[PDB]
Amino acid sequence: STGSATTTPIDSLDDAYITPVQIGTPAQTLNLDFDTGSSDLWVFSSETTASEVDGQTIYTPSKSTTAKLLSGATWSISYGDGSSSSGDVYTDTVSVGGLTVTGQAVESAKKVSSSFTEDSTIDGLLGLAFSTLNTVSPTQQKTFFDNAKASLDSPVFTADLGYHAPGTYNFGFIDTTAYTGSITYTAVSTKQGFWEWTSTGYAVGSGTFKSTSIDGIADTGTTLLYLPATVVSAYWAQVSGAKSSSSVGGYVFPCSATLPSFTFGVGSARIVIPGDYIDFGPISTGSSSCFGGIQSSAGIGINIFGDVALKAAFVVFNGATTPTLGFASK
């Protein structure tokens, strides 16, 4: 089998992407944030504290003839950005882009943190990291991909995120029309539960390529590109007036600037992030200070190839017995 679904930016900055997902019988369609950096499929629901729901579409398990309470199971998650959610668990039928999994763990939120409430466009998350990170207790549950994998034509999914435009998540096949040149594959460590890999270096604008190993994760659920402070300083040094602002929480730059591109290495291959992808707009409405899309990972504890990086590529998440990651230009 295969599946193919369009993923759409939630706003004009590409702060996140939402993908429609069918849950239950009859289908209840919720727009979920596909997150290769976590491993829980959780939704706003009829069980979510009413004051914490503000415009989201909710899953109502009592209206699904295929929903079953997973007795005794609870979940609780905290994300790197400080947001969190928790609740109980149902199993139900879940379909993405025509690909159906029966008995998928659908984690129903009883509580969500303010950042979730405040984002009306995101009805939940669909985790696509390794199932070892799934938070369900006392019986850990599998991701949608893990459940689908054996049925797929090939045990892969691909992320093709758009810049200020929709893109595509495919399951079970590689669309050879969706990228240019060849796909370069690179090794993955699953030891921390992430799609963790090592970039071979970087360049800033038309500058020379610096060969250096940068371990990090391919994370569709993180907006920005978080890299070591040395790398980030070298980038922003090429933007007149750019500075790290402790009060704002990262590098800012004059909105009148033209940003240079940023290149990262995948083996001997190179992915170029155009400068415009690195602009996250005014820090507050009407400001002439703009927020940068490349930020330091210092104090996160890990480098993160988030959407800023991934949207410059066609990315293969290869879930073969030994997983790997593939990147192509597009």
Curated annotation (Swiss-Prot):
Domain Peptidase A1 positions: 17-328
Top-level taxonomic group: Eukaryota
Catalytic residues identified in the record: D35, S199
EC number: 3.4.23.22
UniProt catalytic activity: Hydrolysis of proteins with specificity similar to that of pepsin A, prefers hydrophobic residues at P1 and P1', but does not cleave 14-Ala-|-Leu-15 in the B chain of insulin or Z-Glu-Tyr. Clots milk
Keyword match Protease: yes
Molecular function GO labels: aspartic-type endopeptidase activity
Keyword tRNA processing among UniProt keywords: no
Keyword terms: Aspartyl protease, Disulfide bond, Hydrolase, Protease, Signal, Zymogen
Any one GO biological process: proteolysis
Disulphide bond pairs: C255-C290
UniProt family annotation: Belongs to the peptidase A1 family.
Protein's recorded name: Endothiapepsin
Gene designation per UniProt: EAPA
